[PDB]
Amino acid sequence: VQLVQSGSELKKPGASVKVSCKASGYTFTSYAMNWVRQAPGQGLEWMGWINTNTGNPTYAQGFTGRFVFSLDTSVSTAYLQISSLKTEDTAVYYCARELWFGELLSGDFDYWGQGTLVTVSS
Amino acid sequence: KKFLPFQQFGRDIADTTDAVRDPQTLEILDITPCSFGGVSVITPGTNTS
């Protein structure tokens, strides 16, 4: 089970970026997809999760609108899109695997990706 | 050759029995055909001797 993500990128403030996440070795529709970030120098912050069957996202507080979750089935690659980037968005985003149990999710993060480091600076 | 308790005598690639279970002592015995070979005759000819 491998979780490879896109490479690092540098971008001026005010633009929009997209981060992909490729999964392999396991049935994608069986498990849900969770996202997590880590600003350099602090802990983990969770913005929400997206179901892999119906494709519905569920954002947390403070991440509505700017953050867009989208999936697909044939290519089977998760995407993370952020719009209107500013200086505080400089972090590394990690994909978190969570098995689908229902409307209430557990706290078992079994597999993670290598992360995608973004940096917003002038 | 240890035998699993479900299985009876085995076989080879020539569809011949090679190992068998004894029906009384429940032990494994190998089966090998005994000695055989070709017969060739040396003769100096019917004229000489």
Binding site: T27, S30 | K1, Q7, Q8, F9, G10, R11
Partner: protein, 50 residues
């Protein structure tokens, strides 16, 4: 006597991969150091298992 179970979450099942499982002995014949072909009911490799 029969009783129906309540307070259980009715959920659809999931799928996973069967990595070369389901192989059983086809006959009661001992074989050693031989590649033997067979034609019988088997679990296909890398199949979806509920």
């Amino acid at each position: 006597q029969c009783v129906n179970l309540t307070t259980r979450t009715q959920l659809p099942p999931a799928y996973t991969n069967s990595f070369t499982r389901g192989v059983y002995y086809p006959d009661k014949v001992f074989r050693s150091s031989v590649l033997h072909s067979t034609q019988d009911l088997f679990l296909p490799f890398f199949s979806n298992v509920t």
